[PDB]
Amino acid sequence: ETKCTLKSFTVEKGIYQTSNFRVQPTESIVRFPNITNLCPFDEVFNAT
Amino acid sequence: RSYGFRPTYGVGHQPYRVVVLSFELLHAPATVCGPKKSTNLVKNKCVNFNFNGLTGTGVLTESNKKFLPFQQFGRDIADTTDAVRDPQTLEILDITPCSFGGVSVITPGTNTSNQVAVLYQGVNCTEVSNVFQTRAGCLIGAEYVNNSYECDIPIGAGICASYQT
Amino acid sequence: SYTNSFTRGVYYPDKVFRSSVLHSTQDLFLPFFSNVTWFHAIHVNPVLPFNDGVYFASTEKSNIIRGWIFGTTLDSKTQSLLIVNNATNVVIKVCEFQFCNDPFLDFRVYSSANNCTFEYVSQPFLKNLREFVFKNIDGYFKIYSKHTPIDLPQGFSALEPLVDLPIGINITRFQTLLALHRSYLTPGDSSSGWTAGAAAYYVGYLQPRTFLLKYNENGTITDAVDCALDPLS
Ligand SMILES: *[C@@H]1O[C@H](CO)[C@@H](O)[C@H](O)[C@H]1NC(C)=O
Ligand SMILES: *[C@@H]1O[C@H](CO)[C@@H](O)[C@H](O)[C@H]1NC(C)=O
Ligand SMILES: *[C@@H]1O[C@H](CO)[C@@H](O)[C@H](O)[C@H]1NC(C)=O
Ligand SMILES: *[C@@H]1O[C@H](CO)[C@@H](O)[C@H](O)[C@H]1NC(C)=O
Ligand SMILES: *[C@@H]1O[C@H](CO)[C@@H](O)[C@H](O)[C@H]1NC(C)=O
Ligand SMILES: *[C@@H]1O[C@H](CO)[C@@H](O)[C@H](O)[C@H]1NC(C)=O
Numbered sequence: 001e002t003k004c005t006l007k008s009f010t011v012e013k014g015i016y017q018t019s020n021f022r023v024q025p026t027e028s029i030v031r032f033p034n035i036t037n038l039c040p041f042d043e044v045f046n047a048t
Numbered sequence: 049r050s051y052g053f054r055p056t057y058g059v060g061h062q063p064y065r066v067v068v069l070s071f072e073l074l075h076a077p078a079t080v081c082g083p084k085k086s087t088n089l090v091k092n093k094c095v096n097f098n099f100n101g102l103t104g105t106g107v108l109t110e111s112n113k114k115f116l117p118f119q120q121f122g123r124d125i126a127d128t129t130d131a132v133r134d135p136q137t138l139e140i141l142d143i144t145p146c147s148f149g150g151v152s153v154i155t156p157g158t159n160t161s162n163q164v165a166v167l168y169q170g171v172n173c174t175e176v177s178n179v180f181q182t183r184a185g186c187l188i189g190a191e192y193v194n195n196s197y198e199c200d201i202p203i204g205a206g207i208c209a210s211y212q213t
Numbered sequence: 214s215y216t217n218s219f220t221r222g223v224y225y226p227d228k229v230f231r232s233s234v235l236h237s238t239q240d241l242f243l244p245f246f247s248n249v250t251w252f253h254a255i256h257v258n259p260v261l262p263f264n265d266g267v268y269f270a271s272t273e274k275s276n277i278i279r280g281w282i283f284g285t286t287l288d289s290k291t292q293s294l295l296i297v298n299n300a301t302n303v304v305i306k307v308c309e310f311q312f313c314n315d316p317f318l319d320f321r322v323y324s325s326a327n328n329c330t331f332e333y334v335s336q337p338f339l340k341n342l343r344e345f346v347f348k349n350i351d352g353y354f355k356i357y358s359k360h361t362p363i364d365l366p367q368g369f370s371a372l373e374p375l376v377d378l379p380i381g382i383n384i385t386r387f388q389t390l391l392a393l394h395r396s397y398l399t400p401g402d403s404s405s406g407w408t409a410g411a412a413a414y415y416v417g418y419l420q421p422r423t424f425l426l427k428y429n430e431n432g433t434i435t436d437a438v439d440c441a442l443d444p445l446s
């Protein structure tokens with residue numbers, strides 16, 4: 001990777017920065033309020 | 049005309065109830081929306097969190113800040129989001145960015161040998177053969193010798209590396 | 214009558230928590246040391262225009278001011294809004310209602326024709342100073358409110374957001390509803406017939422200003438600076 005970054009097949013003595021490390025997320029979470037305000041859809045559809 | 053529901057008549061004269069739904073979209077201060085919450089929660093590890101929008105990535109932990117009743121999320125200087133109120137249980141959670149940092153390769157040069165040691169800058173390797181922690185980060189692949197020598201390759205915080213031979 | 218306004222009239226701009234941060238926000242605010250209209254309710258309620266923003270203040274104890282009405286033309290040919298603070302709960306209505314020229318809604322003679330579109334209910338709002346701020350920049354009527362026990366003091370106070378109605382009607386003319394104790398239930402008079410308490414309400418027209426707000430450690434505003442008031446500010 002150091003070779004690939006320097007764009008050369010030979011590397012001299014030293015310290016070289018090559019890439020970045022970052023922990024990838026594990027899973028996704030979605031949060032919303034207590035959505036319970038339902039309309040009278042059923043009360044209208046089942047009306048006599 | 050009278051339906052007259054006897055078993056004599058056919059299928060084309062049966063009492064089918066029907067309903068049709070129509071929708072309006074112009075001039076939308078949206079007040080209706082179908083999709084429910086469909087929520088999920090987990091903490092103590094990096095997750096793609098969505099709190100009434102506010103899409104971001106990070107780890108959620110227990111916070112100690114005292115939000116006001118009407119505040120939903122907070123920010124630090126430079127407008128970085130630090131905390132979010134869980135819309136379900138109203139708990140204030142602290143958001144911390146996931147652990148990341150640049151990695152540098154300590155090399156004595158292909159002229160000498162192919163050995164290499166990697167330095168994770170600023171990372172505490174408690175969360176990612178010899179593993180050694182220094183003020184500049186964590187150094188993997190190099191052993192800490194207690195004999196002091198001249199600095200060959202500077203790592204940082206008064207520590208350097210070199211090929212022993 | 215007109216009266217000068219102290220640092221009062223500030224509110225939380227965007228519902229974000231900030232601790233020990235000086236935030237500069239450019240929005241509709243009440244200019245500091247500005248003259249606001251001062252009217253008495255124990256005498257004389259003419260129709261007053263509703264500009265980009267309105268800051269309503271009330272120094273009352275016997276809840277003489279009971280509600281507000283709004284609308285584009287204040288007639289049935291257009292949409293309108295009504296707010297009433299009953300002792301049990303607040304009643305908010307968007308009905309294009311046809312208000313009379315003097316809605317003495319103690320009687321219930323505030324309007325003649327009504328056919329509603331949108332409603333809302335919650336706990337009621339209420340010697341006591343009550344500060345309200347009405348905002349209609351977007352298709353939603355924002356109501357900020359604050360209540361303080363004590364003229365307008367020189368202290369600091371930040372109004373918190375109370376209600377957010379998602380309605381996109383025009384707000385251009387507004388009037389306040391009076392609830393005198395014992396007077397004839399007819400529009401033949403205005404705020405008379407009974408010795409109504411000393412009720413004074415102030416009207417302030419907000420302007421686009423840049424305010425520098427100071428947040429304390431607990432996320433509440435403690436001081437504000439108007440960048441257009443003084444060269445030092
Ligand atoms: C949502 O419901 C849960 C369980 O019924 C309850 O614990 C929580 O307090 C509720 N939150 C709100 C905001 O109503
Ligand atoms: C390889 O060449 C470099 C460049 O001069 C030098 O520093 C290093 O000592 C050399 N190593 C060997 C083993 O010759
Ligand atoms: C790394 O984490 C350990 C465990 O929490 C701690 O003892 C140590 O001081 C940390 N070192 C650095 C450099 O952060
Ligand atoms: C340097 O000293 C430390 C502390 O005693 C020890 O753990 C380490 O093995 C020593 N290094 C070498 C190369 O012996
Ligand atoms: C709302 O409509 C009324 C009726 O024509 C008009 O007088 C007023 O200027 C309008 N206000 C806005 C903000 O469009
Ligand atoms: C109510 O009546 C007005 C006329 O008085 C009319 O313009 C409006 O469409 C009616 N319906 C609603 C929901 O306002």
Ligand SMILES: *[C@@H]1O[C@H](CO)[C@@H](O)[C@H](O)[C@H]1NC(C)=O
Binds near residue numbers: 429430431
């Ligand atoms: C924040 O509130 C707590 C609890 O009321 C109080 O102890 C603390 O002094 C407050 N912070 C400031 C800066 O006054």
